[PDB]
Design an enzyme around this catalytic site. Sequence first.
Site, mmCIF file in Angstrom:
data_model
loop_
_atom_site.group_PDB
_atom_site.id
_atom_site.type_symbol
_atom_site.label_atom_id
_atom_site.label_comp_id
_atom_site.label_asym_id
_atom_site.label_seq_id
_atom_site.Cartn_x
_atom_site.Cartn_y
_atom_site.Cartn_z
ATOM 1 N N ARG A 230 0.820 -1.206 0.000
ATOM 2 C CA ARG A 230 0.000 0.000 0.000
ATOM 3 C C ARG A 230 0.857 1.261 0.000
ATOM 4 O O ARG A 230 0.523 2.250 -0.647
ATOM 5 C CB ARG A 230 -0.932 0.013 1.217
ATOM 6 C CG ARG A 230 -1.757 1.290 1.352
ATOM 7 C CD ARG A 230 -2.753 1.207 2.496
ATOM 8 N NE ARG A 230 -2.113 1.035 3.797
ATOM 9 C CZ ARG A 230 -1.561 2.015 4.505
ATOM 10 N NH1 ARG A 230 -1.559 3.258 4.043
ATOM 11 N NH2 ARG A 230 -1.037 1.759 5.695
ATOM 12 N N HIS B 228 4.316 1.441 -0.912
ATOM 13 C CA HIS B 228 5.353 1.548 -1.935
ATOM 14 C C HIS B 228 5.117 0.963 -3.322
ATOM 15 O O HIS B 228 5.916 1.204 -4.226
ATOM 16 C CB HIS B 228 6.674 0.992 -1.390
ATOM 17 C CG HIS B 228 7.089 1.594 -0.084
ATOM 18 N ND1 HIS B 228 6.965 0.924 1.114
ATOM 19 C CD2 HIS B 228 7.604 2.810 0.216
ATOM 20 C CE1 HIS B 228 7.382 1.702 2.096
ATOM 21 N NE2 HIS B 228 7.774 2.851 1.579
ATOM 22 N N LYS C 131 22.422 26.413 -19.045
ATOM 23 C CA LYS C 131 21.688 27.258 -18.109
ATOM 24 C C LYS C 131 21.573 26.457 -16.806
ATOM 25 O O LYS C 131 21.051 25.342 -16.804
ATOM 26 C CB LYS C 131 20.305 27.595 -18.671
ATOM 27 C CG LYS C 131 19.586 28.703 -17.919
ATOM 28 C CD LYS C 131 18.306 29.104 -18.619
ATOM 29 C CE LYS C 131 17.629 30.245 -17.880
ATOM 30 N NZ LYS C 131 16.378 30.682 -18.552
ATOM 31 N N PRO C 132 22.083 27.009 -15.691
ATOM 32 C CA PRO C 132 22.064 26.371 -14.370
ATOM 33 C C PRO C 132 20.705 25.860 -13.901
ATOM 34 O O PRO C 132 20.603 24.744 -13.387
ATOM 35 C CB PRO C 132 22.591 27.477 -13.454
ATOM 36 C CG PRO C 132 23.511 28.230 -14.343
ATOM 37 C CD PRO C 132 22.701 28.343 -15.606
ATOM 38 N N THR D 213 12.698 26.877 -15.171
ATOM 39 C CA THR D 213 11.398 26.329 -14.814
ATOM 40 C C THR D 213 10.432 26.391 -15.989
ATOM 41 O O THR D 213 10.420 27.369 -16.739
ATOM 42 C CB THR D 213 10.791 27.117 -13.638
ATOM 43 O OG1 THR D 213 11.772 27.253 -12.600
ATOM 44 C CG2 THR D 213 9.560 26.404 -13.090
ATOM 45 N N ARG E 119 17.278 21.498 -12.928
ATOM 46 C CA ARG E 119 18.484 21.897 -12.227
ATOM 47 C C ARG E 119 19.673 21.147 -12.802
ATOM 48 O O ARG E 119 19.637 19.927 -12.952
ATOM 49 C CB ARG E 119 18.319 21.602 -10.734
ATOM 50 C CG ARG E 119 17.071 22.252 -10.143
ATOM 51 C CD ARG E 119 16.505 21.454 -8.987
ATOM 52 N NE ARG E 119 15.208 21.975 -8.560
ATOM 53 C CZ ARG E 119 14.368 21.335 -7.749
ATOM 54 N NH1 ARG E 119 14.676 20.135 -7.273
ATOM 55 N NH2 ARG E 119 13.213 21.895 -7.418
ATOM 56 N N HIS F 133 10.111 37.417 -17.802
ATOM 57 C CA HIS F 133 11.099 36.692 -17.012
ATOM 58 C C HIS F 133 10.466 35.936 -15.850
ATOM 59 O O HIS F 133 9.619 36.475 -15.140
ATOM 60 C CB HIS F 133 12.153 37.666 -16.470
ATOM 61 C CG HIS F 133 13.001 37.094 -15.374
ATOM 62 N ND1 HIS F 133 13.841 36.015 -15.565
ATOM 63 C CD2 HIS F 133 13.127 37.442 -14.070
ATOM 64 C CE1 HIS F 133 14.447 35.725 -14.429
ATOM 65 N NE2 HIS F 133 14.030 36.574 -13.506
ATOM 66 N N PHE F 134 10.889 34.690 -15.657
ATOM 67 C CA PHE F 134 10.389 33.870 -14.558
ATOM 68 C C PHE F 134 11.293 34.170 -13.366
ATOM 69 O O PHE F 134 12.488 33.883 -13.405
ATOM 70 C CB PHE F 134 10.467 32.384 -14.907
ATOM 71 C CG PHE F 134 9.782 31.494 -13.911
ATOM 72 C CD1 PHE F 134 10.425 31.117 -12.734
ATOM 73 C CD2 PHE F 134 8.479 31.062 -14.131
ATOM 74 C CE1 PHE F 134 9.778 30.328 -11.793
ATOM 75 C CE2 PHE F 134 7.821 30.271 -13.195
ATOM 76 C CZ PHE F 134 8.471 29.903 -12.022
ATOM 77 N N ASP F 135 10.727 34.757 -12.318
ATOM 78 C CA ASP F 135 11.506 35.118 -11.142
ATOM 79 C C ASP F 135 11.685 33.981 -10.145
ATOM 80 O O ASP F 135 12.820 33.620 -9.817
ATOM 81 C CB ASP F 135 10.895 36.346 -10.462
ATOM 82 C CG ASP F 135 11.877 37.060 -9.552
ATOM 83 O OD1 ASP F 135 12.904 37.565 -10.054
ATOM 84 O OD2 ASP F 135 11.622 37.118 -8.333
HETATM 85 CL CL LIG Z 1 14.232 34.434 -17.252
#
Ligand SMILES: [Cl-]
EC number: 4.6.1.18
Lengths: 124, 124
Positions: free
Chosen positions: B10, B12, B41-42, B45, B85, B119-121
């Site tokens: 149940r 796992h 790019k480090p 998202t 990442r 830009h994604f912050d």
């Molecule tokens: Cl960006």
Amino acid sequence: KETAAAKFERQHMDSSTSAASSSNYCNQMMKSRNLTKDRCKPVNTFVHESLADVQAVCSQKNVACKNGQTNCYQSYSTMSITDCRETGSSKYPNCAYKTTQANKHIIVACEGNPYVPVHFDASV
Amino acid sequence: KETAAAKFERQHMDSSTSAASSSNYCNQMMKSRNLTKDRCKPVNTFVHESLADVQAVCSQKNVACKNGQTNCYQSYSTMSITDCRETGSSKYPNCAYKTTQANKHIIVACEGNPYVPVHFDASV
Ligand SMILES: [Cl-]
Ligand SMILES: [Cl-]
């Protein structure tokens, strides 16, 4: 000349239904399996293999357990795994999790007769 | 009675379905989106919501950007995202990434006319 708006879309947008659903896997599974009942279990791993294949691990590589026990076994082959880890902003009863997919060797603790897995130890 | 064995199944086992996503999602996406062309790019998202919903964020909770600017906004609702990442073993031109998924509020920087995300912050 690629516009700023289009650039954002190229590096940050992927409107996919399946992608959106996969992001909610752990949230849904942790609840379905009653793992968020009276508290949020912080970490848990799900194995996407047949039960027989996992039960067979108990008759494989005998390894040491993280708690000092010696009833742990490691799988010979890699298995499809999904790591569910609690998010920083997680709040009961709406337990939030991060979904991570991986192919690793599982280590489980076995007991009883038949000698079957009773605890998930780790992955390597 | 729920035996230790049953409890393991149940907690796992998920034999009925394959992984809802691939661990190679980021490696594929970072490449196709030309995010690894000039360098690895480090971190990046990807949002899995409709473009309209993401653009709407520019007219929601005005929050301060991590860089001190005030042209950032946080989404009212949580959105399905994927964090890419760079792996510690990654090295240009062979960029390698770890894929992680979750449902979080996004924070973007907007500008222009129409007022759109450029830009994604961050996430929260
Ligand atoms: Cl960006
Ligand atoms: Cl626990």
